[PDB]
Each structure stands twice: as C-alpha cells, then as structure tokens.
mmCIF file with all atom_site columns, C-alpha atoms and ligand atoms in Angstrom:
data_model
loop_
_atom_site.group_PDB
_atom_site.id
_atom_site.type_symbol
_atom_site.label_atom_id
_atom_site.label_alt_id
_atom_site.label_comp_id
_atom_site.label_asym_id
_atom_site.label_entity_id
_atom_site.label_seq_id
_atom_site.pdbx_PDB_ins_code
_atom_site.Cartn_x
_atom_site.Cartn_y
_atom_site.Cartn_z
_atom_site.occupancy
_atom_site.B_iso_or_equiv
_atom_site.pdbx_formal_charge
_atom_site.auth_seq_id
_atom_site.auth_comp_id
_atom_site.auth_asym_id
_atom_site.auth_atom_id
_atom_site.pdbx_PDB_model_num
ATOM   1   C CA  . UNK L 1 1   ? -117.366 147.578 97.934  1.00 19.35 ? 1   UNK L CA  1
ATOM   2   C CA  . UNK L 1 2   ? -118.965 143.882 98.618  1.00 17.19 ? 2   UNK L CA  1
ATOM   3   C CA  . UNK L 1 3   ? -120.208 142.496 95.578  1.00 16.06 ? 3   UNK L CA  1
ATOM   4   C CA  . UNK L 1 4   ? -124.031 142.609 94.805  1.00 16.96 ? 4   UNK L CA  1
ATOM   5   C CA  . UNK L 1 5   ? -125.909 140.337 94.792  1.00 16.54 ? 5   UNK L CA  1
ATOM   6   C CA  . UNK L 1 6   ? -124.130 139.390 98.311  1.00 14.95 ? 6   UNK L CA  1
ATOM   7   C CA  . UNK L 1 7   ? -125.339 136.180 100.457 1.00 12.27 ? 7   UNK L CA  1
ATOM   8   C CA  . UNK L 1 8   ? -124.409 136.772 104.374 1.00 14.42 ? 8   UNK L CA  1
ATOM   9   C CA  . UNK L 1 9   ? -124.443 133.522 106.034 1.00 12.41 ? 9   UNK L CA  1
ATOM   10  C CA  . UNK L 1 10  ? -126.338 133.470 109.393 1.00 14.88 ? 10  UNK L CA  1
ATOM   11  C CA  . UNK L 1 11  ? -124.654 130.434 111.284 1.00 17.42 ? 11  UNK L CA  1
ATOM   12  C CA  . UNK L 1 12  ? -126.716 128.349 113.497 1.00 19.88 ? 12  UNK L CA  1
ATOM   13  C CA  . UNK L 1 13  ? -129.501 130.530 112.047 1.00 18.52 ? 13  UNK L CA  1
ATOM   14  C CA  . UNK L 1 14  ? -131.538 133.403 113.644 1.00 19.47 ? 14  UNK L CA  1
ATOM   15  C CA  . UNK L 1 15  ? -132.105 133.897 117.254 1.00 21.47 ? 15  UNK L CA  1
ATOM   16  C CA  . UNK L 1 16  ? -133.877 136.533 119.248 1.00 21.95 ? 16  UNK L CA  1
ATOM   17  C CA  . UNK L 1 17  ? -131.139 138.872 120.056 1.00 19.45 ? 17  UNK L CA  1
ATOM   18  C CA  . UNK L 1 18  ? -129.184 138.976 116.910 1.00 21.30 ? 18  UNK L CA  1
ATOM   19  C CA  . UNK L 1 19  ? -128.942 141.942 115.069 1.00 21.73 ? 19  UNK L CA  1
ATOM   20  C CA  . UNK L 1 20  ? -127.719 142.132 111.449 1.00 19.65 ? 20  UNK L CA  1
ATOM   21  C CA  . UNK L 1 21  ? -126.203 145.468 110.277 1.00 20.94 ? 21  UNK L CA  1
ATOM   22  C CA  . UNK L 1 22  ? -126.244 146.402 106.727 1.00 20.76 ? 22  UNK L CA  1
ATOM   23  C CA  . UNK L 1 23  ? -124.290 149.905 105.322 1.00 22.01 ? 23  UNK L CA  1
ATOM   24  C CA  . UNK L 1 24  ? -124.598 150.731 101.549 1.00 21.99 ? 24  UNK L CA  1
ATOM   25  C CA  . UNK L 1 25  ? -125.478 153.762 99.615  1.00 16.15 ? 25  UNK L CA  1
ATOM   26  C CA  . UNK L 1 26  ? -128.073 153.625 97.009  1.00 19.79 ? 26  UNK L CA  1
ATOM   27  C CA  . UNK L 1 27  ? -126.988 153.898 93.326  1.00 20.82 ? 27  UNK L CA  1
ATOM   28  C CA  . UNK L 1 28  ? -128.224 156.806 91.296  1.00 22.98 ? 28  UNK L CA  1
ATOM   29  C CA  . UNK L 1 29  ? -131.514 156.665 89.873  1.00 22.79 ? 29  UNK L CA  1
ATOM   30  C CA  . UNK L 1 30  ? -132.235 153.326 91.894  1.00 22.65 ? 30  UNK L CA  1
ATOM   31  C CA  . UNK L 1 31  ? -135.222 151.056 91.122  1.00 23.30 ? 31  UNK L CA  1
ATOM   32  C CA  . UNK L 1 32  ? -135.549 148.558 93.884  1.00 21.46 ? 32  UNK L CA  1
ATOM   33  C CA  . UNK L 1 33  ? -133.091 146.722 96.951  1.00 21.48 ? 33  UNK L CA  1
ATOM   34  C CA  . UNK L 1 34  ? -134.143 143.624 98.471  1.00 19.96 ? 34  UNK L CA  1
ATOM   35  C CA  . UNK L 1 35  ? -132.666 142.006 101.425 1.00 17.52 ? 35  UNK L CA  1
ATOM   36  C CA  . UNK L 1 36  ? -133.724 137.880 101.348 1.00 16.31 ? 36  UNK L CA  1
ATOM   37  C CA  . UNK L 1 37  ? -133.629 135.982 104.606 1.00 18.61 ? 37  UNK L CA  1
ATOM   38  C CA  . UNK L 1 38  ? -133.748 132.420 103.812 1.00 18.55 ? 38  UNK L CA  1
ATOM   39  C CA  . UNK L 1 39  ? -134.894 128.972 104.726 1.00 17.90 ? 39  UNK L CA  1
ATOM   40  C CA  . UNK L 1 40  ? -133.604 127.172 101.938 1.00 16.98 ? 40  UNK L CA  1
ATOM   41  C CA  . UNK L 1 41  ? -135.667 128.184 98.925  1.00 12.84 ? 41  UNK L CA  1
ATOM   42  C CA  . UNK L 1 42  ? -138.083 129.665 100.820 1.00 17.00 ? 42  UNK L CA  1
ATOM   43  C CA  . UNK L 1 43  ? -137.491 132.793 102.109 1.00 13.53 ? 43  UNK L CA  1
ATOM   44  C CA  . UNK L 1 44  ? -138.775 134.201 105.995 1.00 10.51 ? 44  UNK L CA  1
ATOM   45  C CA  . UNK L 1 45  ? -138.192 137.712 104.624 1.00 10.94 ? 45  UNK L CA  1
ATOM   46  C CA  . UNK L 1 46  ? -138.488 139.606 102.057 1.00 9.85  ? 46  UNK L CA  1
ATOM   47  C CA  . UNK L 1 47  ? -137.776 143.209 102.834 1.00 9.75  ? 47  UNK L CA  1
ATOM   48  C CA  . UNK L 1 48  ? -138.251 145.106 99.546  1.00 7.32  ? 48  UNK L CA  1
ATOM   49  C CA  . UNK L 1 49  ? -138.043 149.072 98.683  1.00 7.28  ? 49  UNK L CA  1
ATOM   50  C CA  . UNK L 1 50  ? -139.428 150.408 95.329  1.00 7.64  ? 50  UNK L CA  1
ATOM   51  C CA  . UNK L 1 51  ? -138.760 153.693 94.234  1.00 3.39  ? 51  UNK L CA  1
ATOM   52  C CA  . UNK L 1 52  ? -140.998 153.596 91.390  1.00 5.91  ? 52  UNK L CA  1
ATOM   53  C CA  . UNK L 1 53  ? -144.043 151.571 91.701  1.00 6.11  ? 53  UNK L CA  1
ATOM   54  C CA  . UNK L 1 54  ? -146.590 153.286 89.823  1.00 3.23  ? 54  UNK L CA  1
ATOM   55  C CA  . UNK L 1 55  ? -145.289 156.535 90.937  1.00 5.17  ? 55  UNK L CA  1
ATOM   56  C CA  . UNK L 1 56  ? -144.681 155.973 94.538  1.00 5.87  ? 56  UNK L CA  1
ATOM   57  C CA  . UNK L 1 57  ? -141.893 154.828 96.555  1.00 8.96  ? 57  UNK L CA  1
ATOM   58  C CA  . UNK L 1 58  ? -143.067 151.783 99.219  1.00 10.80 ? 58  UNK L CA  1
ATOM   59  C CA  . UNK L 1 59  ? -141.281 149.158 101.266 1.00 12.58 ? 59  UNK L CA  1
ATOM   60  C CA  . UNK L 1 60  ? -143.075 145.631 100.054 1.00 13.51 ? 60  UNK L CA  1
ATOM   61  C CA  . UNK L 1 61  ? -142.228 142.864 102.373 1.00 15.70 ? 61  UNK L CA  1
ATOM   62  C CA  . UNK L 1 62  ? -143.413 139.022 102.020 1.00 18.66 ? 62  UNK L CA  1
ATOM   63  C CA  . UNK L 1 63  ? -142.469 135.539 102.610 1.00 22.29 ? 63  UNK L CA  1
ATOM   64  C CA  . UNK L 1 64  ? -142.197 133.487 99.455  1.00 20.34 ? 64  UNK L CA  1
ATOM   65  C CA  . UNK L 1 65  ? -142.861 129.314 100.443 1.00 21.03 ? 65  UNK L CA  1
ATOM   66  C CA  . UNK L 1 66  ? -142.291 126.995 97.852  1.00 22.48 ? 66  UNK L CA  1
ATOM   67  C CA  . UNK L 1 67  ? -141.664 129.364 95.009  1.00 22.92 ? 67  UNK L CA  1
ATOM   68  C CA  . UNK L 1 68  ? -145.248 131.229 96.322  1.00 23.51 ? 68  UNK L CA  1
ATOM   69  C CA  . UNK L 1 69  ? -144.898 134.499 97.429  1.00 25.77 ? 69  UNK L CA  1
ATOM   70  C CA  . UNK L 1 70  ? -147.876 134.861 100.082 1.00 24.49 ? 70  UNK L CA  1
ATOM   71  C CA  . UNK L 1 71  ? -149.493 138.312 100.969 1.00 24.91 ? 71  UNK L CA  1
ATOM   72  C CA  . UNK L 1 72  ? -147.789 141.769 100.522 1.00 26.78 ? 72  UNK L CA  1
ATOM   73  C CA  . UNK L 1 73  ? -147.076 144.198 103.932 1.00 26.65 ? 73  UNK L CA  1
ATOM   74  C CA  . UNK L 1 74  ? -147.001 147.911 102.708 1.00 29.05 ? 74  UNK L CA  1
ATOM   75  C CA  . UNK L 1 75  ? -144.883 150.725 104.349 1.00 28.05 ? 75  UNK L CA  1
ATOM   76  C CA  . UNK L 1 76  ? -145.120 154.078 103.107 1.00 28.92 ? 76  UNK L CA  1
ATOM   77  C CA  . UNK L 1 77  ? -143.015 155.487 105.202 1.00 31.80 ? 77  UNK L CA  1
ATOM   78  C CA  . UNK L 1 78  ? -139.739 155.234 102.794 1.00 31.31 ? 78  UNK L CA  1
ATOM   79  C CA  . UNK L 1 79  ? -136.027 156.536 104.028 1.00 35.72 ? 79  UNK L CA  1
ATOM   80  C CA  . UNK L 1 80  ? -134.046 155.501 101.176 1.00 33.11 ? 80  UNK L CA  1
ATOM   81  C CA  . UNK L 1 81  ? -132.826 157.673 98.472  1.00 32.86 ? 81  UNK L CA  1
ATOM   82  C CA  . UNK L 1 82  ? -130.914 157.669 95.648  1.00 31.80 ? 82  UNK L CA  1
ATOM   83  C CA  . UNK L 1 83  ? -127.827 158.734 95.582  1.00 32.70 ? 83  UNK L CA  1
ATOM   84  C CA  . UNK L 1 84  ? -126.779 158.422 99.510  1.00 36.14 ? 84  UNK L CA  1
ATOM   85  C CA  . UNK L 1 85  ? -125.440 156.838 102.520 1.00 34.38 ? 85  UNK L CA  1
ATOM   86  C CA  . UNK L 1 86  ? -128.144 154.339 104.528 1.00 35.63 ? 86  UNK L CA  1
ATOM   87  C CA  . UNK L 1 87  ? -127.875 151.996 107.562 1.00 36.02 ? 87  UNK L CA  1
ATOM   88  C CA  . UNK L 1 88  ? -130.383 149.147 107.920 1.00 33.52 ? 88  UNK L CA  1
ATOM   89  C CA  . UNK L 1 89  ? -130.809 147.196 111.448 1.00 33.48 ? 89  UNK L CA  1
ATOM   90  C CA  . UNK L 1 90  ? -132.989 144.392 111.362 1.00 29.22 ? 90  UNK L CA  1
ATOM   91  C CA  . UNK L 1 91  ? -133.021 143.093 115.321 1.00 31.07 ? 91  UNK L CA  1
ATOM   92  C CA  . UNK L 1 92  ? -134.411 139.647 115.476 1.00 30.21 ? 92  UNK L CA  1
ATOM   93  C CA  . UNK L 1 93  ? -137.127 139.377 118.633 1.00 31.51 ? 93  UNK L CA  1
ATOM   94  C CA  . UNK L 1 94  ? -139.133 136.351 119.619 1.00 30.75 ? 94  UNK L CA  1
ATOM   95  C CA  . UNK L 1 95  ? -142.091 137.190 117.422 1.00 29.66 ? 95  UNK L CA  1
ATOM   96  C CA  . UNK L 1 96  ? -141.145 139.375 114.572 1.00 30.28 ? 96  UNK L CA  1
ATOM   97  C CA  . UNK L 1 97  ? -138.453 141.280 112.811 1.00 27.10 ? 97  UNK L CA  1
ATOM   98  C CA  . UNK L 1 98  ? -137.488 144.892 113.800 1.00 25.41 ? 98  UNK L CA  1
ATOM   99  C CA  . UNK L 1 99  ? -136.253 146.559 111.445 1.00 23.51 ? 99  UNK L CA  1
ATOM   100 C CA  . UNK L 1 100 ? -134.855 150.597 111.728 1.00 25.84 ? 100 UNK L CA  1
ATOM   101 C CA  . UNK L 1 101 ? -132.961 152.413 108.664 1.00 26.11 ? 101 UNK L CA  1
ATOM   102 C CA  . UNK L 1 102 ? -130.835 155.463 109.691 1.00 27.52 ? 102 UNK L CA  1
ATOM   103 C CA  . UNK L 1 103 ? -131.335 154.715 113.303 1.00 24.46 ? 103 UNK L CA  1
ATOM   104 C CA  . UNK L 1 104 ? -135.277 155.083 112.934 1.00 22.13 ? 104 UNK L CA  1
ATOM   105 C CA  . UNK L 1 105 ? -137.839 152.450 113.488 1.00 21.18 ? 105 UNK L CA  1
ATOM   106 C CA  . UNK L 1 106 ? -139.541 151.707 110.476 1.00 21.39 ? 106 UNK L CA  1
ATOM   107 C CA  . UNK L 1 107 ? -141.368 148.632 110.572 1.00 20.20 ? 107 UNK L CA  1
ATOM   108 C CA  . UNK L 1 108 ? -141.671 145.364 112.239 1.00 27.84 ? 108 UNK L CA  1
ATOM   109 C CA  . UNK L 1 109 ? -142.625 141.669 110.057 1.00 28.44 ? 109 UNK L CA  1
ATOM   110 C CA  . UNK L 1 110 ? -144.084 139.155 112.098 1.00 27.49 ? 110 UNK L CA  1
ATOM   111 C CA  . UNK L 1 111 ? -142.626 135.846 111.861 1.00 28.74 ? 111 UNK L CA  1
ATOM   112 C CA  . UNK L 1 112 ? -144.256 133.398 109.239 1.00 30.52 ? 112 UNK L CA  1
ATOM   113 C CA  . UNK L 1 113 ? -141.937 130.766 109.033 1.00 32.15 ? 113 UNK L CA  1
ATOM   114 C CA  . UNK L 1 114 ? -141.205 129.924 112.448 1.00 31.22 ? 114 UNK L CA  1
ATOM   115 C CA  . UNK L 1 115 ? -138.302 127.515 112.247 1.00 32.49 ? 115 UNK L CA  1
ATOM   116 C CA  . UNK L 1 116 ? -135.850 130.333 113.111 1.00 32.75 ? 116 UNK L CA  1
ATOM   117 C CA  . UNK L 1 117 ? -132.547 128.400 113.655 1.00 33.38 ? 117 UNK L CA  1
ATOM   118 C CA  . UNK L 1 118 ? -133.502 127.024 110.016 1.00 34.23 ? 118 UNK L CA  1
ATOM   119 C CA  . UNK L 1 119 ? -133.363 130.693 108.295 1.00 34.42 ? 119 UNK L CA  1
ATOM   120 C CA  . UNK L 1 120 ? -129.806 130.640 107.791 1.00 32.29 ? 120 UNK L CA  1
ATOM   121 C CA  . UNK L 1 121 ? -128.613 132.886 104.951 1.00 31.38 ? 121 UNK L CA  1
ATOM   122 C CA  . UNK L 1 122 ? -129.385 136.125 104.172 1.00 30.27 ? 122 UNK L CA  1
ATOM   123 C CA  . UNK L 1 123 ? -129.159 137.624 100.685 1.00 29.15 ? 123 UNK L CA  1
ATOM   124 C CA  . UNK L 1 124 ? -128.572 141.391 99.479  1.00 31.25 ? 124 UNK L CA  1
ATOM   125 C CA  . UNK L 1 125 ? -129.639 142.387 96.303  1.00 30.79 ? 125 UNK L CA  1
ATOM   126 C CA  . UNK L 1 126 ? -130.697 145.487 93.896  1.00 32.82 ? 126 UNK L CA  1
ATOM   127 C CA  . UNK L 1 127 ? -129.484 149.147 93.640  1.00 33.86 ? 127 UNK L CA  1
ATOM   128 C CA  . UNK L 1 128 ? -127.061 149.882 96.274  1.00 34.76 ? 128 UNK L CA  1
ATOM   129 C CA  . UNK L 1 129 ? -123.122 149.674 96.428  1.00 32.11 ? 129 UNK L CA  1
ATOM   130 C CA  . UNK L 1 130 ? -122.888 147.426 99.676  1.00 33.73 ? 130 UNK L CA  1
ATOM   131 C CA  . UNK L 1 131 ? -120.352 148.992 102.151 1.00 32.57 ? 131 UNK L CA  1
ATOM   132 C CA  . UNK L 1 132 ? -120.884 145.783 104.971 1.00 31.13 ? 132 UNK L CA  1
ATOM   133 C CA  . UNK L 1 133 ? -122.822 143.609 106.008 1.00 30.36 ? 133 UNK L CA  1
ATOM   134 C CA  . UNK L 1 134 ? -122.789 141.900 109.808 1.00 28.11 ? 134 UNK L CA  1
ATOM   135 C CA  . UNK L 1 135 ? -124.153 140.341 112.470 1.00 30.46 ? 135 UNK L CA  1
ATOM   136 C CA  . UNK L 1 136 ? -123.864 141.001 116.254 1.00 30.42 ? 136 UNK L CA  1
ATOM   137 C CA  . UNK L 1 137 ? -125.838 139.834 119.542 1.00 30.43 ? 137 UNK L CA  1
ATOM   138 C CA  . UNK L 1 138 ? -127.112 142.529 121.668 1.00 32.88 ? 138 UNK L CA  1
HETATM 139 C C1  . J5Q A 2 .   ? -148.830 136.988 92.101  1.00 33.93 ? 1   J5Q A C1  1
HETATM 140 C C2  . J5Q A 2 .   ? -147.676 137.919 92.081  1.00 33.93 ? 1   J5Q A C2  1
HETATM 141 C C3  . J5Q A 2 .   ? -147.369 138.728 90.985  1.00 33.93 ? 1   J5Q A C3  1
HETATM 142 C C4  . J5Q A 2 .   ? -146.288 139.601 90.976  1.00 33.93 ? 1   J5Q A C4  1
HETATM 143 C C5  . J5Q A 2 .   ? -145.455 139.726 92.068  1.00 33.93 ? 1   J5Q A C5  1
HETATM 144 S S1  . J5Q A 2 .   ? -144.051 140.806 92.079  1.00 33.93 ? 1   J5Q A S1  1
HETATM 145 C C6  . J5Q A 2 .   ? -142.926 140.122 93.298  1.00 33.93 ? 1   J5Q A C6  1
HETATM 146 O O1  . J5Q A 2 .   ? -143.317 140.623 94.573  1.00 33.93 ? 1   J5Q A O1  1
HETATM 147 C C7  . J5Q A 2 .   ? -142.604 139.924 95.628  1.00 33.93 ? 1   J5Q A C7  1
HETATM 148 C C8  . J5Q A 2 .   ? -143.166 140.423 96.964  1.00 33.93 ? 1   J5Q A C8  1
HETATM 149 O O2  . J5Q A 2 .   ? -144.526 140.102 97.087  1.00 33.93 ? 1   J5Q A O2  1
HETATM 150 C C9  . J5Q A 2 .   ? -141.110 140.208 95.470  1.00 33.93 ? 1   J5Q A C9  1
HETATM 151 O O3  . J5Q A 2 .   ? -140.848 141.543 95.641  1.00 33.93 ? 1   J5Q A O3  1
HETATM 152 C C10 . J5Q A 2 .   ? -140.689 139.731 94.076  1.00 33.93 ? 1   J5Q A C10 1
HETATM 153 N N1  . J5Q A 2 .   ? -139.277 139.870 93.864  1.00 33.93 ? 1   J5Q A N1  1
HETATM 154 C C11 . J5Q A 2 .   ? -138.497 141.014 93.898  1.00 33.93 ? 1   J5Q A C11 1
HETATM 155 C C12 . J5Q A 2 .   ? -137.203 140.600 93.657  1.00 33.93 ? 1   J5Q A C12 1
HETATM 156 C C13 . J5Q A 2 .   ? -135.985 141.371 93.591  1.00 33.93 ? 1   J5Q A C13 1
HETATM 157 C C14 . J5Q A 2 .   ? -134.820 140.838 93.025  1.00 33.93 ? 1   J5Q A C14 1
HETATM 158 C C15 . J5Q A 2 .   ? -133.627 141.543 92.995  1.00 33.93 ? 1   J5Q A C15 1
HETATM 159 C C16 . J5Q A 2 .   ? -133.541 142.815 93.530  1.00 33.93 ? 1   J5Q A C16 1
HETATM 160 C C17 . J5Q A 2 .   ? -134.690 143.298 94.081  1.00 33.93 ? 1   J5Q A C17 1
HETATM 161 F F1  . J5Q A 2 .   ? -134.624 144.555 94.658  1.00 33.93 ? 1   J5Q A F1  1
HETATM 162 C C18 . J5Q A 2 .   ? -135.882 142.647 94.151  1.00 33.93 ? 1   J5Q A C18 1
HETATM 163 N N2  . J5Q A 2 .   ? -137.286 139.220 93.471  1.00 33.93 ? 1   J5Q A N2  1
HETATM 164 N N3  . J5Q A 2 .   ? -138.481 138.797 93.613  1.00 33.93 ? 1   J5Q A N3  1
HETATM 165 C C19 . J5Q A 2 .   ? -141.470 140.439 92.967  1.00 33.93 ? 1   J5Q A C19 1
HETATM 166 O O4  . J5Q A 2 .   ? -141.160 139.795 91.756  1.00 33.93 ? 1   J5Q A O4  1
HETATM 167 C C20 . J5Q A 2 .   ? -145.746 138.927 93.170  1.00 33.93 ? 1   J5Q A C20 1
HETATM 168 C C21 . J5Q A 2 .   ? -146.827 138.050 93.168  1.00 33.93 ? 1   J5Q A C21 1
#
C-alpha cells in the first residue's frame, strides 16, 4: 500500500552486489509499469512493461540523457499480468543490470551511464499497487 508514483532512495548509489526488491500486484486491466533508476535527470534505467503496444505485451528498456531517450532493448518474454501478485529483483553486477521477476531471469541491461555511485534514486511508477520496495547486499 506505498503510494505510486514511489521514489526509493539508493544511498551512496548503486554498487555491484546490491539487490533491490520490488513486490506489487498489477492493477486490473493495466497499461504500462516503469521502474526509473536515476542519475539526476537522467535516468541509467528505464525498465518498462507494456501490455498493449500495438497488440502485444513487451518489456521496453532505455536510458534517457538529457531529456533524450537513446535506443530501445525489446523483451518479449513478458511475466506480468493483470490482476496478480509479482516480485521484481534487479541485482546490480559490475557490467549490467540483472533483472528476474517471479524468481526467473528475464533480462539483463548493460550499463550506459557508468557513474554508478551517481545513480542514486530509483522511481516506481504505472499500474501496480506497490506492496515494498527494498534494497539488500548479497
Ligand atoms: C523518439 C521517441 C518517441 C516516443 C517515445 S515513447 C517513450 O519511450 C521511452 C523508452 O524508450 C519511455 O518508455 C517513455 N516513458 C514511459 C514513461 C512512463 C511513465 C509512467 C509510467 C510508465 F509505466 C511509463 N515515461 N516515459 C515513453 O514515453 C520515445 C522516443
């Protein structure tokens, strides 16, 4: 029961090791989520499911660097659905971000802005009811 749109601070940053946790369940009839992990303005990550682009559900993910989002990574693979429960793990390594949803791996983002102790918020947005939203090292 967090409020949407949530911001997560990320003190000191990201580091290899950290893992952020998200739990929500997706609203009925849901159009879009979008988790935001940001440098300022800019923001590292953009991890973005669609359940109705032109018919099709995808996972969009991007970097947007002053106010210019740069170039689109597709997933088809697409776990979420309306109406239900959902985990999301994004694991920070050295060179990308791993994310898994519902304990599967389902894509990894390789890091674009590279200032990683700089990327120090993370926003939550779109059709879900946010449960929690946390950060651990493993
Ligand atoms: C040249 C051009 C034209 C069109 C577009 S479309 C654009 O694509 C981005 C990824 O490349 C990103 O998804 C962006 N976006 C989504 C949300 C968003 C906000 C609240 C909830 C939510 F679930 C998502 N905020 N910004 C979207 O507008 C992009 C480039």
């Amino acid at each position: 029961p967090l409020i949407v749109p949530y911001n997560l601070p990320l003190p000191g940053g990201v580091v290899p090791r950290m893992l952020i946790t998200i739990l929500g369940t997706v609203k009925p009839n849901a159009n879009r989520i979008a988790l935001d992990f940001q440098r300022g303005n800019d923001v590292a990550f953009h991890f973005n499911p669609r359940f109705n682009e032109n018919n099709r559900r995808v996972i969009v993910c991007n970097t947007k660097l002053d106010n210019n989002w740069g170039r689109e990574e597709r997933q088809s693979v697409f776990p979420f659905e309306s109406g239900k429960p959902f985990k999301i793990q994004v694991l920070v390594e050295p060179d990308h971000f791993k994310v898994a949803v519902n304990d599967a791996h389902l894509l990894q983002y390789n890091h674009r802005v590279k200032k990683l102790n700089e990327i120090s918020k993370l926003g939550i947005s779109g059709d879900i009811d946010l449960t929690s939203a946390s950060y651990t090292m493993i």
